[PDB]
Every structure is written in structure tokens, then in C-alpha cells.
Nucleic acid binder design. Structure first.
Ligand code: K
Ligand code: K
Ligand code: K
Ligand code: K
Ligand code: K
Ligand code: MG
Ligand code: MG
Ligand code: MG
Ligand code: MG
Ligand code: MG
Ligand code: MG
Ligand code: MG
Ligand code: MG
Ligand code: MG
Ligand code: MG
Ligand code: MG
Ligand code: MG
Ligand code: MG
Ligand code: MG
Ligand code: MG
Ligand code: MG
Ligand code: MG
Ligand code: MG
Ligand code: MG
Ligand code: MG
Ligand code: MG
Ligand code: MG
Ligand code: MG
Ligand code: MG
Ligand code: MG
Ligand code: MG
Ligand code: MG
Ligand code: MG
Ligand code: MG
Ligand code: MG
Ligand code: MG
Ligand code: MG
Ligand code: MG
Ligand code: MG
Ligand code: MG
Ligand code: MG
Ligand code: MG
Ligand code: MG
Ligand code: MG
Ligand code: MG
Ligand code: MG
Lengths: 51, 206, 203, 251, 120
RNA sequence: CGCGACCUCAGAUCAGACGUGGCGACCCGCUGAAUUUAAGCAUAUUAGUCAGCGGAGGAGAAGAAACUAACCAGGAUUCCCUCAGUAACGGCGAGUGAACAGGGAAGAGCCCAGCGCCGAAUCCCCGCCCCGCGGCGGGGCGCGGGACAUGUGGCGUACGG
RNA sequence: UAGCGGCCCCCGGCGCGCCGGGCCCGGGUCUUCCCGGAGUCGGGUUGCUUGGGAAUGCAGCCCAAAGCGGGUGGUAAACU
RNA sequence: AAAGCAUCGCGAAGGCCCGCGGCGGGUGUUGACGCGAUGUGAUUUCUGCCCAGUGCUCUGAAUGUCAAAGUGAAGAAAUU
């Protein structure tokens, strides 16, 4: 589920990623924290790819 | 069936209550048994106080009882730290310790810190070895003064400060108590919607 | 140390590494008997945090329990009552399958004391638990003051009286507004106190 | 109501089969190396009556391939076999009455009996007296064979399924009118407790859906749904049609 | 491979942990001999292998392990499945060898998940 | 081929131990009705009660906050008085129904895993001798055995260390 | 029967009295380091339960965590 | 009841039935000349018309209805 969420975040479907993670992890507050840290690893991957 | 004027009553007697009825015929026997245990414990622990270790002053919570104080479970770690008593040592010398309690205000902390210090002066400490005393109370102090202190140790009493009569000033006569309460309630009730509106106009103007 | 990593790895149960290990283990456990003594704890980290020690007198038993609810065992689904009590399916047991697993291990080994149990795998029909058992008469157990408590007779069949971690979870114990049902020690204790008519001598 | 007669039968009890004097399980020889790659010879030592069964059974003795020991096998007797006759079982056995061959090696139109439903099940199809199966076609690519069963159904089976060449002995048994209730009594006394049969309309409502009435009558359609619960599923279960079957059988 | 592992065990044999009986000999001898002269001689504890996954894991994290050898047949494999990656991250060389029982024989035990060199 | 190590298993009338069954007033874990009330009756009530099953002890269970509160705050559990037939639940019908504060009885606090450091510093069994000595053991010894690095023990646990 | 009545025998805790023995540092200040229990919490849904009422507790199934996090704050939800 | 007659289901991953449960058990040491379910009631001679109703059964290209899960859209989210 963390992989599909990252796929949605990569197409910039942030709303869809949040609605997906909420169904999987449960609460809205747990969903934001998860989505946020998955954004960081995607951002981390972009930096590594650039370098 | 109701008859004429009466109260509508709903007695809670629809279960097998007769099977669970606690009678109190052993109440005199229970009181005797508790008394003998108290006396037996006091003889065993003499000359230590019969009631038990000293308890702190605490203020009862809620608006119904915050005007009264009572005995707490035990002295907080901050109170013992200020008084200079190690938390492990406090139990042996008859001081109750409650690590859960936290001191929100300094008035309560100083009240119990003073209580601990005044207790420490009143304490007579027998040496572990009667022949050899190190830092214990004086032989004379132990020989005569030591006796079992009955009743709570340093009972916690509600102290009321007397306020002498005085001339009423002009300001006090002009103070509107009713309007101060009525406006204070409205200020608290409308504080948020006022912060919203005042903020809302801020970006409206800017 | 190593245990912290094993603890973190076991939290990643849908990772590729752990998905493989759980599946291959669950297949293996499905090929054994319902009650089977394990040579050693499958999860050394989880075992020792639950009370296990690598010393003689501690044993592990793997228990397999069927998953699902509790069908009402009435003949032909007839309950002979009012419609409120006509339910036969969609009924749930009051205790957990982990509690049932401890009860099975405890009943089989009546000479041992159930300490705790932990999950090790599941499939559609079975859940696998590893119960830590202690032999209360081994000298390594009786001569250790930290474990001398389990040797006392009051701790006989803790799993059958709801005193293990898994067992006590179903009792409704706890502190606070939520756990008012069991003020006094148990739901039965609270009910007795609240339904007992206190008739004093002077009324 | 109470539990109806059809529902009591499943509990076993008085409805269990009478197997005291039955001679054994009439089955083919267990498949092994010899009957996979060549053939094995056996001799018919006796042809015996099995109580409750209209078909005779044949005691056939084969040598054991791996141990010095004789193996006795109880076969369904193909009509025409006689005591002292050698019968051969295997892939390389010849097409003779009483021989056992895989249906793959049989030519199309072969008449067989005691045919395996699955490869190695030792014979399940066309075992009653006077019944047989016909080999229709083969599919050498898929290793499959089409057969026609006594009911008229056509079934696709593996070509490794073995069968006995010929028809089951004892045919024509149903031609004789039983005539007497006593002959029917003796017939089922060797089978199971299923006779005589009381009509449901002659019972009371408590014990059959058709019971009751001031006249004897079903009162409800006899045709009943396939999903009807046990205790209700009586009469014509899932009938596609009812009435004198006029013309030919369809599908 | 076979010849490297044989070479690895040849060096690791020189740093096998003292048996309890061997340690007792060392002690009585050290206690009695140092009693005659000056007892206070801590000197240097000689280098020795470090065994156990917990002991090795801390050594890797502190970068105190010069070489880590892990058995390939640890079960459950969770006990060491992180170890090759951890050694790579801290930049300490690690080798997987055949047989936890082979490692256990070094430390006079039945098995051993891993051993580590710190000093030689 | 074989010889070894480990792992996972198995057998024994193997050496030494342990469980079973009873009683069941009170206690713990399950399961669990209907009579009855509702002037009928199905939710409700009876009732988480009777019956059924399992497990204990002289008590049991509970228990040192993932607590209560919203105050100038209290401070493990259990029991009593009160809260209170109340807040609340309810064909909002019949009926049902706690808690917190307050006053008392009693009062007691703690230990691991983890995280680290200490040369496994730890434990069980066996043999011998010396002493208290109905087996309770203390120590000494043994190039005795085993457990144990898939982690024993000392220190340390949210009050910090 | 009464009696801080007598005598005899047995049993147990305490009180001081060599030993068989073991065991033996603590507190404060400062700097630095360390710090936590997962198919669990939580979410959905089902059934039971509760005074707990847009769900008090329990269990099944499915989903399935985090670490300035997590739980609670008696009306569902977002923000603070 | 009965022989006789007729109808119905089923080729075993099956029909019919049992069972709280184990894909446990009966038929079944069985296999359509068999098992299971009904009606009628030996033989003789016949068994007409009705498929509108109610059953049962077949069919599912496709329209009309049709739950949970899922998918979409709006919303801060619940939710719609
Ligand atoms: K009828
Ligand atoms: K749930
Ligand atoms: K069957
Ligand atoms: K019609
Ligand atoms: K019709
Ligand atoms: Mg008191
Ligand atoms: Mg062992
Ligand atoms: Mg009933
Ligand atoms: Mg229950
Ligand atoms: Mg207890
Ligand atoms: Mg307890
Ligand atoms: Mg409670
Ligand atoms: Mg009451
Ligand atoms: Mg009936
Ligand atoms: Mg009969
Ligand atoms: Mg008939
Ligand atoms: Mg009849
Ligand atoms: Mg009649
Ligand atoms: Mg009927
Ligand atoms: Mg008639
Ligand atoms: Mg009729
Ligand atoms: Mg009519
Ligand atoms: Mg023996
Ligand atoms: Mg018993
Ligand atoms: Mg009595
Ligand atoms: Mg009534
Ligand atoms: Mg009446
Ligand atoms: Mg009535
Ligand atoms: Mg109830
Ligand atoms: Mg009862
Ligand atoms: Mg007893
Ligand atoms: Mg008690
Ligand atoms: Mg705590
Ligand atoms: Mg309280
Ligand atoms: Mg009142
Ligand atoms: Mg409710
Ligand atoms: Mg009630
Ligand atoms: Mg209170
Ligand atoms: Mg440790
Ligand atoms: Mg007298
Ligand atoms: Mg918080
Ligand atoms: Mg809030
Ligand atoms: Mg006729
Ligand atoms: Mg008819
Ligand atoms: Mg007609
Ligand atoms: Mg016409």
C-alpha cells in the first residue's frame, strides 16, 4: 500500500494518495503523516537521481 | 395500580434480590476486630506513630471543594528534593512519598516543604545499634520524650485568615460587581468570534 | 543490539523479506500437529520481552487454532427462545484465539505454568501462537527469587482464569471512564456489589 | 413437525447397508509397473454370488511381481468368463473378453465394463449387471478418451483409465416380474432397510409435507425446488418436466 | 569458498575464547604469581574473538569490528538478516561462511550466529 | 563409501521430579435460558441470572495510571457511607442505571525486556571431603558433565538511568 | 464458677549474648552518553455487552501504524 | 403395504440425507439392470382437452430492478 500511495504521489495525485492511505491506515491524521514522509522519500529519490 | 394522588415509584426489586442481601449483624464484631488489629499494630510498631506516616497537605479538586485542604497520599519528589530528603530514606523515617504528584504552584510546594522540615525537627531517631549512635537523636531525647503519637501526624487543618474591619474607600463603593461578572462572561463567550472578525478584517484591509 | 533490529524487522510484516518468511513458516507449521513443542522460541526478541529466559525450565509450545467466530452449537440451528436469541452464526467468542491457544497449551501440560504467548503466523483457517511455559519445580526456576512467584499454588492454570496477558484482555479490566464495568476486580465482582441490597442494622 | 423418513436415512442407524455376507469390494487390480508397461496373467478360480448385487463376481488369482505370493482379486464378472480361464491385465494385454486394458489402447467402439472414472481408482463405471460403456473416440494429443455411459451420458476421461472388455454378467435381471411382495422383501433384506415404502399422502402432516387432508391428496405442487431444505425436498426434485415421456429423451 | 573459509578458520583458531577451566587456571596462576610481587598488574587483556549477534551488532555500530563472519544457516534468519547490510553501512568487511556449528566450535559451543575480529 | 559437527525429530519399565481426582460456601474464566413483567406481544425485562463447563486459595480476583479532572487541582487496588434511583439507557413504555469529587477502613511498593557496560562475570546436575545436619543446606575440590553468545548474571526501568 | 490463681509438660515469635557464616560504600554538583513492549495500537464492519447515548467494553474478519509519537479529554468531523 | 405402472434427480468436485464441529458421516464392501425422491396400485381395457393461474424447470445475448466491497466527483473532513 505504501508503493501504490507513492505511485499516486508521483503523478501529483495528492488528494487521491491521501484518500487511499486513509482507507489503508485508518484515521485522517495518521494518513497525513504517512503521505508526508512518503513525499520525502520520493524527494530523496529525485535528489539521488539528479546526482 | 395507582390509587388517587401518589408518587410514581419504580422500586428496583425485579431481580432475585433476596439471594443478594447483605446484613450487618457482624458490624459490632467487625468494629471489635478492626480495633484489636489497630492496637496490635500499634504495639508492634511502637514508638512509631500509630496512625502511620506523615501525609502532605493537598487542595481538594473541583469548584465544590477547592476551598478546603486535606491529607494527601504522599509528599511529591520536588517537595522532598527541596526539603533535602532522599526519596528512598523518606519511607524508613515515616514520610509518605507519592512520585505521581506534581506541584503546579509554589504555594502548595512551600506549604509541604515547611511541613517536612517541621516534621524533621519533631522526629526522634533511635540509633540502629543502641550502644553506638551515629547522627541519631540524643540519648536523653530518646529516653524520655519518645512516646507513640496517637492520631494523624500533624493533622491538616483548614486555616482561615482573620480580616479586620476597615473603612470602605470610594473606589470599592463604586466597583460594579454585577456588571463586572456580566461583562466578564460575555468577554469569555465572545472572545473567539471577536478574534475571528478582528483577524478577518485584517487581510480585508491589507 | 541485535534485538532492536529484529523488533523493527518484525514490525515490517508486509515487506518482501517478512512476507516470504511468514509464508514459508506458516506452511511448515501447517504440516505439524495442532500441539507441538518448539525446540526454541521462533521469535527470540518477542519471547524474552514477554518473560522468557534462555535457561532450563522454560519451554515453548506451538499451538494451532482454527480461525473464525463461534457458531452456536445447537442442533439444526434451533435455539428455542425469543427471536433476540435465535442467532447461530455471526456470533463471536468472548476470549481471543490467542487466549484459546494458551488454554490448549496449559491443559495439555498440566505440570507447567503458562507465562505468555505470542503470534508467529496465520492463514485463512489457522492462527499459530507460541506459548512460553515454565516448569515450576525445576531448581533453576525455584532457586531464582525473580521467578519464585510462578511456583506458588495461586498461579495454577493462569490461562484458565484469565490471568495471562492474552486472557486478561477480554475481561474489561483497566483504569478510567471506559473500564467502569469491572470496578472491584471483575465484571462479576462489580455486578455483585451493585446488585447486593445492603440492609444495615439501623435503617 | 417431526423428522421425515427421508431425513432419518442419513443418520445411518437402521438404514445402514447389510454387508455381513458380502464377499468384498469388487474392484480392479491396483495399477502397478507390470500393468503400466506390459501385462500380467491371472486365472479365474471361482465365480461367486455377492448378496445384494445382481452381478456375479470373479475370484482371480495373480502372481505377485515382488514377493513369492499369490494375490487374489475380486473382479466384476464380465459375461462369458469361466473358471480356469486366464485373464490378462495391462497396457499390452490383448482385446479379449475379461481382459483389463487402458481405454487409450482400445479401438473405437469397444464395449467395456468396470471402467475407472479416474486413472487408478480401480473401477467405478458400468458395474451393475448387464451394463457396459462404449469407447467413442480418442484424443492422443491431450491423452483423453470419450466414452458413453449406461445412462446415455458421454464423458471425457483420461486414456490411462482401465476397464474390463465385455459386458457385466447377469444381464436381463430386471426383465422378470417380481410378482410377490415376499420376493421384494427378500431382495431388499440383502441390500438395506428401504422397503416397503409408505406414501407421503398416507402419513400425517407432522411427518411428511404431503400428509393430511380429509382426502388423500398432495395439495401442493409435487415438483420441488433444488434448494428446498431437507424435510421439504420431497416429491419430484428439480423436475425439468413431468408427465408421460412421449417422443425421445433430450439433451 | 572452501580454501578461503579454511584460511579464515586458521586465523580465527588463534583467537578462540578461553574455556571456563582454562580461565580458572589463568586466574589461580595469576593470583598466586602476582601475590608474590605486585598484585596490581592489569597489563593488557589479549585480543580474542567476539561471539554472538548482539555483541557483534554493537561492535559494528561502534566501528570496532575489523572483520565480521556470519553463519549462513541461522534459523530464524531474522537474527542476522540485517547484519550484512549493517556491516556494509558502517564500512566493515563481512563474510558469510558455511555452518553455524562450525562457528560454534570456535567458541566451544554448539552453534554461533556470528563472530567478529577486533584486534589481532 | 565413510568418519564427524549441528539442526529438526524419535524410543526407553532410562536418573530424578511434576499434573490428574475430590470439595466447591465464598473467588476467577467461559457459556447461558425460559417462566416472569410489560395487564396481549416480538425490542426490552427476567439476566449476563438459573442450569452447563473449566480453574483456584485461605481468601480469590484487583492493583501501583496510556487515571481522574478542567480545580488554588488531585494521585495504585479493594471495601464502606455518600454521590443516587442521579447523569444516562429505554416499543423514552414497562422498566433500567453507573462514575468523579467528599468522608472513612486499610495503606506498600516494585521487577523485567529493551538500551548499554562488565573476559558468561550466570545457572542445573554429578562425584568427594569438612561443618552445622529428620535433605535444609554452607564452603572447598574435580585438565567432572551439561545449559548458555538464537544471550545467563551484576548494574538499570520512565519516580529517569 | 471467680481469680495479672497454682503446678507440670510441650510449642512459637521477639530481646540481648559468640559465631557457621555470608555481604558491604553512599549522597551532591557539573559535563557527556543513553532511553522503552506490533498482526499491537488505530480504522472499517459484524455480533454480543454496557447507563455510555453518531458505538462503554469484548471478540471475529478485513485493513494495518507512528515516534516532537501514541492514548485520553462522555456528540460524528477538519483545523488549532 | 404389495407386485405392476409412471414420473423425477444424479456420471462422484455427484444426487439424496446426517452433523455443533473436523471438506466429518450414511446410501457406499455402492456406480444408472444403481442409489435417492414421489405418485398410482394385480391382470384386462383405456388414460381425452387445458401451460391462462400456482409450482418446477430451461435460457441470460440484453433491457428493467438489484447488496456489500470497489471506482469516480464535490467537500476541511465527516459526509453527500
Ligand atoms: K396432504
Ligand atoms: K473490531
Ligand atoms: K455422498
Ligand atoms: K397452466
Ligand atoms: K405454467
Ligand atoms: Mg488507619
Ligand atoms: Mg533445552
Ligand atoms: Mg433456549
Ligand atoms: Mg459472554
Ligand atoms: Mg493473587
Ligand atoms: Mg496479579
Ligand atoms: Mg476499572
Ligand atoms: Mg440495585
Ligand atoms: Mg423436528
Ligand atoms: Mg422395512
Ligand atoms: Mg411402488
Ligand atoms: Mg406405498
Ligand atoms: Mg391416517
Ligand atoms: Mg409439514
Ligand atoms: Mg387415493
Ligand atoms: Mg391421491
Ligand atoms: Mg382442491
Ligand atoms: Mg525412571
Ligand atoms: Mg482439579
Ligand atoms: Mg460456614
Ligand atoms: Mg405479558
Ligand atoms: Mg397478566
Ligand atoms: Mg402470554
Ligand atoms: Mg443478560
Ligand atoms: Mg450456575
Ligand atoms: Mg486449600
Ligand atoms: Mg487480600
Ligand atoms: Mg509505572
Ligand atoms: Mg480512586
Ligand atoms: Mg437525594
Ligand atoms: Mg445502547
Ligand atoms: Mg440489565
Ligand atoms: Mg471518590
Ligand atoms: Mg541482560
Ligand atoms: Mg478459672
Ligand atoms: Mg498528547
Ligand atoms: Mg479538543
Ligand atoms: Mg393396473
Ligand atoms: Mg402422479
Ligand atoms: Mg388425464
Ligand atoms: Mg380443445
Amino acid at each position: 500500500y505504501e508503493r501504490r500511495a507513492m505511485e499516486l504521489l508521483k503523478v501529483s495525485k495528492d488528494k487521491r494518495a491521501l484518500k487511499f492511505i486513509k482507507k489503508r491506515v485508518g484515521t485522517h491524521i495518521r494518513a497525513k503523516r504517512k503521505r508526508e514522509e512518503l513525499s520525502n522519500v520520493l524527494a530523496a529519490m529525485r535528489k539521488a537521481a539528479a546526482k | 395500580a395507582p390509587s388517587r394522588n401518589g408518587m410514581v415509584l419504580k422500586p428496583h426489586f425485579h431481580k432475585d434480590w433476596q439471594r443478594r442481601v447483605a446484613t450487618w449483624f457482624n458490624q459490632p464484631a467487625r468494629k471489635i476486630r478492626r480495633r484489636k488489629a489497630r492496637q496490635a499494630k500499634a504495639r508492634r510498631i511502637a514508638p512509631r506513630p500509630a496512625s502511620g506516616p506523615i501525609r502532605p497537605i493537598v487542595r481538594c479538586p473541583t469548584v465544590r471543594y477547592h476551598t478546603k485542604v486535606r491529607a494527601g497520599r504522599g509528599f511529591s519528589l520536588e517537595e522532598l528534593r527541596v526539603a533535602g530528603i532522599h526519596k528512598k530514606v523518606a519511607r524508613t523515617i515515616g514520610i509518605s512519598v507519592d512520585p505521581r504528584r506534581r506541584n503546579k504552584s509554589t504555594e502548595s510546594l512551600q506549604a509541604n516543604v515547611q511541613r517536612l522540615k517541621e516534621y524533621r525537627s519533631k522526629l526522634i531517631l533511635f540509633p540502629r545499634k543502641p550502644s553506638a549512635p551515629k547522627k541519631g537523636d540524643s540519648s536523653a531525647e530518646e529516653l524520655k520524650l519518645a512516646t507513640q503519637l496517637t492520631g494523624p501526624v500533624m493533622p491538616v487543618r483548614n486555616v482561615y485568615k482573620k480580616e479586620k474591619a476597615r473603612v470602605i474607600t470610594e473606589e470599592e463603593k463604586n466597583f460594579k460587581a454585577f456588571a463586572s461578572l456580566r461583562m466578564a462572561r460575555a468577554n469569555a463567550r465572545l472572545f473567539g468570534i471577536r478574534a475571528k472578525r478582528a483577524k478577518e478584517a485584517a487581510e480585508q484591509d491589507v | 543490539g541485535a534485538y532492536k533490529y529484529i523488533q523493527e524487522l518484525w514490525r515490517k510484516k508486509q515487506s518482501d523479506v517478512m512476507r516470504f518468511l511468514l509464508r514459508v513458516r506458516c506452511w511448515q507449521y501447517r504440516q505439524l500437529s495442532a500441539l507441538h513443542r518448539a525446540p526454541r522460541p521462533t521469535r527470540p526478541d518477542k519471547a524474552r520481552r514477554l518473560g522468557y529466559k534462555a535457561k532450563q525450565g522454560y519451554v515453548i509450545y506451538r499451538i494451532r487454532v482454527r480461525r473464525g467466530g463461534r457458531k452456536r452449537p445447537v442442533p439444526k440451528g434451533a435455539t428455542y427462545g425469543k427471536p433476540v436469541h435465535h442467532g447461530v452464526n455471526q456470533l463471536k467468542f468472548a476470549r481471543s484465539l490467542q487466549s484459546v491457544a494458551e488454554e490448549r497449551a496449559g491443559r495439555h501440560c498440566g505440570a507447567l505454568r503458562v507465562l505468555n504467548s505470542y503470534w508467529v503466523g496465520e492463514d485463512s483457517t489457522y492462527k499459530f501462537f507460541e506459548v512460553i511455559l515454565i516448569d515450576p519445580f525445576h531448581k533453576a526456576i525455584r532457586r531464582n527469587p525473580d521467578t519464585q512467584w510462578i511456583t506458588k499454588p495461586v498461579h495454577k492454570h493462569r490461562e484458565m482464569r484469565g490471568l495471562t496477558s492474552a486472557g486478561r484482555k477480554s475481561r474489561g479490566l483497566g483504569k478510567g471512564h471506559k473500564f467502569h464495568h469491572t470496578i472491584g476486580g471483575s465484571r462479576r465482582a462489580a455486578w455483585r456489589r451493585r446488585n447486593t441490597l445492603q440492609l444495615h442494622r439501623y435503617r | 413437525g417431526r423428522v421425515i423418513r427421508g431425513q432419518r436415512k442419513g443418520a445411518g442407524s437402521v438404514f445402514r447397508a447389510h454387508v455381513k455376507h458380502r464377499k468384498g469390494a469388487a474392484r480392479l487390480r491396483a495399477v502397478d509397473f507390470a500393468e503400466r508397461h506390459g501385462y500380467i496373467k491371472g486365472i479365474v478360480k471361482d465365480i461367486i454370488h455377492d448378496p445384494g448385487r445382481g452381478a456375479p463376481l470373479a475370484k482371480v488369482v495373480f502372481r505377485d511381481p515382488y514377493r513369492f505370493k499369490k494375490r487374489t482379486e475380486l473382479f466384476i464378472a464380465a459375461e462369458g468368463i469361466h473358471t480356469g480361464q486366464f485373464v490378462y491385465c495391462g497396457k499390452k494385454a490383448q482385446l479379449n473378453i475379461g481382459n483389463v486394458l487402458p481405454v487409450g489402447t482400445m479401438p473405437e467402439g469397444t464395449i467395456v465394463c468396470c471402467l475407472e472414472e479416474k486413472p487408478g481408482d480401480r473401477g467405478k463405471l458400468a458395474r451393475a449387471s448387464g451394463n457396459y460403456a462404449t469407447v467413442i473416440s480418442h484424443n492422443p494429443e491431450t491423452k483423453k478418451t470419450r466414452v458413453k455411459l449406461p445412462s446415455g451420458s458421454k464423458k471425457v476421461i483420461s486414456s490411462a483409465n482401465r476397464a474390463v472388455v465385455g459386458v457385466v454378467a447377469g444381464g436381463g435381471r430386471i426383465d422378470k416380474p417380481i410378482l410377490k411382495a415376499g420376493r421384494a422383501y427378500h431382495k431388499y433384506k440383502a441390500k438395506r432397510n428401504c422397503w416397503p415404502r409408505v406414501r407421503g399422502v398416507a402419513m400425517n402432516p407432522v411427518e411428511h409435507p404431503f400428509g393430511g387432508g380429509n382426502h388423500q391428496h398432495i395439495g401442493k405442487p409435487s415438483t420441488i425446488r433444488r434448494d428446498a431444505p431437507a424435510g421439504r425436498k420431497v416429491g419430484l426434485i428439480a423436475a425439468r418436466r413431468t408427465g408421460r415421456l412421449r417422443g425421445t429423451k433430450t439433451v | 569458498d572452501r580454501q578461503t573459509a579454511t584460511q579464515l578458520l586458521k586465523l580465527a583458531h588463534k583467537y578462540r575464547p578461553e574455556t571456563k577451566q582454562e580461565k580458572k587456571q589463568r586466574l589461580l596462576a595469576r593470583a598466586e604469581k602476582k601475590a608474590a610481587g605486585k598484585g596490581d598488574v592489569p597489563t593488557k587483556r589479549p585480543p580474542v574473538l567476539r561471539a554472538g549477534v548482539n555483541t557483534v551488532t554493537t561492535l559494528v555500530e561502534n566501528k570496532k569490528a575489523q572483520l565480521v563472519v556470519i553463519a549462513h544457516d541461522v534459523d530464524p534468519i531474522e537474527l542476522v538478516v540485517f547484519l550484512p547490510a549493517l556491516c556494509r553501512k558502517m564500512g566493515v568487511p563481512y563474510c558469510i561462511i558455511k555452518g553455524k556449528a562450525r562457528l560454534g566450535r570456535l567458541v566451544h559451543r554448539k552453534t554461533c550466529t556470528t563472530v567478529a575480529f577486533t584486534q589481532v
